[PDB]
C-alpha cells in the first residue's frame, strides 16, 4: 500500500551568506513512486528545480534528490514542499543552515 | 546484463 515520504532539506556545501550553492531536497521512503517536489524561496516556488532519476531501496520504497542552485543570505528562507498521495496535505520542511 | 522474465504473474 502507501508509505509517507521523509525529507531532509540541506545544502551541498556548507552555507555562507553570499556564496552560491546547491540546495537539496532528499525525499526517501515513499510509495507510490509518483511524487511532486517543489522548493520554495520566501514562500515562492523556485522555478528551475532539478530532479534526479528515481531509484528504489531494497525495502521497495523510492527516493529522489530534488535540487536547485541558490544563494543563502542572513534573511531568505528556503523550504521544500512535497506533495504525495500518501498524505492529505503537502509537507513543507524549511531549510535549517545548522541542520 | 539484466535478466529476462519467463512466466508472467
Amino acid at each position: 500500500i502507501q508509505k509517507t515520504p521523509q525529507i531532509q532539506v540541506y545544502s551541498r556545501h556548507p552555507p555562507e551568506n553570499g556564496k552560491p550553492n546547491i540546495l537539496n531536497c532528499y525525499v526517501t521512503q515513499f510509495h507510490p513512486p509518483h511524487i511532486e517536489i517543489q522548493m520554495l524561496k520566501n514562500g515562492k516556488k523556485i522555478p528551475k528545480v532539478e530532479m534526479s532519476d528515481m531509484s528504489f531501496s531494497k525495502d521497495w520504497s523510492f527516493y529522489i534528490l530534488a535540487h536547485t542552485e541558490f544563494t543563502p543570505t542572513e534573511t531568505d528562507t528556503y523550504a521544500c514542499r512535497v506533495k504525495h498521495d500518501s498524505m492529505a496535505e503537502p509537507k513543507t520542511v524549511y531549510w535549517d543552515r545548522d541542520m | 546484463k539484466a535478466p529476462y522474465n519467463f512466466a508472467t504473474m
Binding site: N24, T28, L65, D98, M99 | K1, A2, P3, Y4
Partner: protein, 274 residues
C-alpha cells in the same frame, strides 16, 4: 566479498495509456552502472559509470530489446494482478523486481535473488535454493502455482548462476579502479545554542564515498541520546551525515566525535574549537 550485481525494475501502470512506465536500473557493488527508462525520447539502456563505455553497440541494442520485452512482461503481469486483487485500471499500480547475484569471497555464486513487490509490498520471491518460492498473499499463490506449473524457477536459476555471474565478473574487471574508489570524509564540529545553559554540538562528515559511515560521540568514555540523520547525497556523488549531541555550557571540551569511513586511513577524532 560479497561483491554483487542487481537489477531493480519498476513498472507503474498508467490509467488511460496503452501501457506503463518501466524503469530498469543495474547496480554492481551497489553503484548504479546501467539504466533504462521507457519515457526517454529514444528509450535505451545507457551507461551510468564511465567504465561501461567499454562495451560495444551490440550490447546496448541487445539489452535495450530485453527492456522492451520486460516492459511487456510487466504490462501483462500488471493486468493479471488487477484480476487477482479485484482492482480496476482507473488507478495507477506499481510492480517491482529485484534480482541478481552475490559472489562470496571465494568468487563463486553465494546467493541468488529474484523477488517481486506489488504496490510496494512483498509478493513473490525465489527462495535461496533457487527451486521454490515464497508467496506473501493468497494472491501470490495464484502466481506461485502458475510458476511451479510452468517450471519458471529453473530458467531464472540459469540466469542467476550463468549470465549473472558471467557478467558480474566482467563488470568487476572493467571497473576495478572505479569500484574500489573511496573519498574520505572531511569533518567539522559546530556549536549551536539550544537551551540555557545546555548547548548542541554537531559533528559533520562531508564529501565522502561510499555512503557507509559511522559517526560516534564520546564523553571521555563512550555514548545519552545523540540525534543523528540518515546519510544524504550531496548531489555530487559524495555523501553527508551528521550526529549531534546535547551538552552543558563550558563543559564541552570533554566531548569527542569519531568518523569511521573505509576511505579514511585512520578514524578521525574531532571536538569543538572556537
Amino acid at each position: 566479498g560479497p561483491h554483487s550485481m542487481r537489477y531493480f525494475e519498476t513498472a507503474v501502470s498508467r490509467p488511460g495509456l496503452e501501457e506503463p512506465r518501466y524503469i530498469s536500473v543495474g547496480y554492481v557493488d551497489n553503484k548504479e552502472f546501467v539504466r533504462f527508462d521507457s519515457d526517454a525520447e529514444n528509450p535505451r539502456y545507457e551507461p551510468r559509470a564511465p567504465w561501461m563505455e567499454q562495451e560495444g553497440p551490440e550490447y546496448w541494442e541487445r539489452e535495450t530489446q530485453k527492456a522492451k520485452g520486460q516492459e511487456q512482461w510487466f504490462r501483462v503481469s500488471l493486468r493479471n494482478l488487477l484480476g487477482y486483487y479485484n482492482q480496476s485500471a482507473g488507478g495507477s499500480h506499481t510492480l517491482q523486481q529485484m534480482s541478481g547475484c552475490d559472489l562470496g569471497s571465494d568468487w563463486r555464486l553465494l546467493r541468488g535473488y529474484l523477488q517481486f513487490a506489488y504496490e510496494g509490498r512483498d509478493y513473490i520471491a525465489l527462495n535461496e535454493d533457487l527451486k521454490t518460492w515464497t508467496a506473501a498473499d493468497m494472491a501470490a499463490q495464484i502466481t506461485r502455482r502458475k510458476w511451479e506449473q510452468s517450471g519458471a524457477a529453473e530458467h531464472y536459476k540459469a540466469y542467476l548462476e550463468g549470465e549473472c555471474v558471467e557478467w558480474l565478473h566482467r563488470y568487476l574487471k572493467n571497473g576495478n579502479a572505479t569500484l574500489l574508489r573511496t573519498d574520505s570524509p572531511k569533518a567539522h564540529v559546530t556549536h549551536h545554542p539550544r537551551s540555557k545553559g545546555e548547548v548542541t554540538l554537531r559533528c559533520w562528515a562531508l564529501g565522502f564515498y561510499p555512503a557507509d559511515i559511522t559517526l560516534t560521540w564520546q564523553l571521555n568514555g563512550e555514548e545519552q541520546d545523540m540525534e543523528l540523520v540518515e546519510t544524504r547525497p550531496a548531489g555530487d556523488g559524495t555523501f553527508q551525515k551528521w550526529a549531534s549531541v546535547v551538552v552543558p555550557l563550558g563543559k564541552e571540551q570533554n566531548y569527542t566525535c569519531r568518523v569511521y569511513h573505509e576511505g579514511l586511513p585512520e578514524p578521525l577524532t574531532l571536538r569543538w574549537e572556537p
